[PDB]
């Protein structure tokens, strides 16, 4: 939550987060991808935002409970940050915490639901890295 840029890598299946131009979210093992790399801030206390660099636009949530990228920051772009015991991060959905709705990849590469995510999943785990 904080300065420099980094990358977001899931051990589930081995993907990196990926933010793309149309607007679509998934993950990729490809690590030259520059649509990759990231950059977090922190609104207050344990809550953040997650930008790409490359194209400008913001991680976001739906109704449904599908992620996918937006232009401008809005409330279904914020999300509440965890440092677990194992010493992975979690990010959860805001505007729908009452129902523990996490971020998450499959072991496919493509996105987890929210209705679909349980904490103990591999899926759930991310690990910051350098740039
Ligand atoms: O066809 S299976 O009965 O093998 O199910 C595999 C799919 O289930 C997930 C979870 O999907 S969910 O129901 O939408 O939440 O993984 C679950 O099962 C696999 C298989 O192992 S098992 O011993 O036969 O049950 C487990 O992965 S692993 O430990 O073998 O590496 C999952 O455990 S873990 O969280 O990865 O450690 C297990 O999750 S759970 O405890 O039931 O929540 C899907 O994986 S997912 O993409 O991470 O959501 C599997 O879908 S698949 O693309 O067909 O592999």
């Given at each position: 939550?904080?300065?420099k840029?980094?990358?977001?890598?899931?051990?589930?299946?081995?993907?990196?987060?990926?933010?793309?131009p149309?607007?679509?979210?998934?993950?990729?093992?490809?690590?030259?991808?520059?649509?990759?790399?990231l950059?977090?801030?922190?609104?207050?206390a344990?809550?953040?935002?997650?930008?790409?660099?490359?194209?400008?636009?913001?991680?976001?949530?739906?109704?449904?409970?599908?992620?996918?990228?937006?232009?401008?920051?809005?409330?279904?772009?914020?999300?509440?940050?965890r440092?677990?015991?194992n010493?992975?991060?979690?990010?959860?959905?805001?505007k729908?915490?009452?129902?523990?709705?996490?971020?998450?990849?499959?072991?496919?590469?493509?996105?987890?639901?929210?209705?679909?995510?349980?904490?103990?999943?591999?899926?759930?785990?991310?690990?910051?890295?350098?740039?």
């Amino acid at each position: 939550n904080y300065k420099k840029p980094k990358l977001l890598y899931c051990s589930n299946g081995g993907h990196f987060l990926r933010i793309l131009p149309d607007g679509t979210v998934d993950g990729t093992r490809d690590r030259s991808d520059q649509h990759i790399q990231l950059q977090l801030s922190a609104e207050s206390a344990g809550e953040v935002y997650i930008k790409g660099t490359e194209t400008g636009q913001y991680l976001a949530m739906d109704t449904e409970g599908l992620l996918y990228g937006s232009q401008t920051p809005n409330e279904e772009c914020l999300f509440l940050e965890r440092l677990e015991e194992n010493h992975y991060n979690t990010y959860t959905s805001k505007k729908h915490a009452e129902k523990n709705w996490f971020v998450g990849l499959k072991k496919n590469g493509s996105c987890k639901r929210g209705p679909r995510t349980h904490y103990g999943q591999k899926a759930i785990l991310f690990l910051p890295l350098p740039v």
